[PDB]
Design a protein around this ligand. Structure first.
Ligand SMILES: CC[C@H](C)CN(C[C@@H](O)[C@H](Cc1ccccc1)NC(=O)OC[C@H](C)C(=O)OC)S(=O)(=O)c1ccc(OC)cc1
Lengths: 99, 99
């Protein structure tokens, strides 16, 4: 598909047995999801953006389906105001910027 | 061009006669550049990201040439972690997401 940018590029993702709305975010190196109690091991991490840093939990090898395209990789979980699909998963679903 | 996402989508922009590197950021509503001087009146504004809120200066109707494509629109200036081209200008240059 092609997604224009008049509005936020929110799409449906499926992770850990839940469907969620998330931004397709070319400015995000990593994928950052709203607080959720995912199973398995994790590592603490702090990530920085506008306003400063937040603390997140890094889960690896998590299956995430994005608009019917399967992905698997690292997901960071923490108190973000929006779910963010970052480049680590965008590349896996074949996403490019075009102009 | 078509830009893949295995690396950060950084491009050269021209603004006020100066060349800068900036990130094509589909998760940013607005364009925000690190501290710099721009001519004309500005309005104080606050914007919020993953780490909270910052104060910025809002300059309106500013020409920016982004990887050879012309835009004229709102540019925020303040303590962003990196130079960001957001959707307000991405739309002007005809940028879409494709997968
Ligand atoms: C440093 C470049 C940018 C700021 C990184 N961020 C991605 C941005 O696309 C980020 C995504 C986001 C949107 C809304 C609320 C919170 C986050 N955009 C963002 O902060 O936009 C804030 C507002 C809406 C704006 O337009 O400001 C100019 S991030 O902070 O969300 C982020 C940081 C590290 C990551 O992985 C290491 C992933 C995401």
């Amino acid at each position: 598909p092609q997604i224009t940018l008049w509005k936020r590029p929110l799409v449906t993702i499926r992770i850990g047995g839940q469907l969620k709305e998330a931004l397709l975010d070319t400015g995000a190196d990593d994928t950052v999801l709203e607080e959720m109690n995912l199973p398995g091991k994790w590592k603490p991490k702090m990530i920085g953006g506008i306003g400063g840093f937040i603390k997140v939990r890094q889960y690896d090898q998590i299956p995430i389906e994005i608009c019917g395209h399967k992905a698997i990789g690292t997901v960071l979980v923490g108190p973000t105001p929006v779910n963010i699909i970052g480049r680590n998963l965008l590349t896996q679903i074949g996403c490019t910027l075009n102009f």
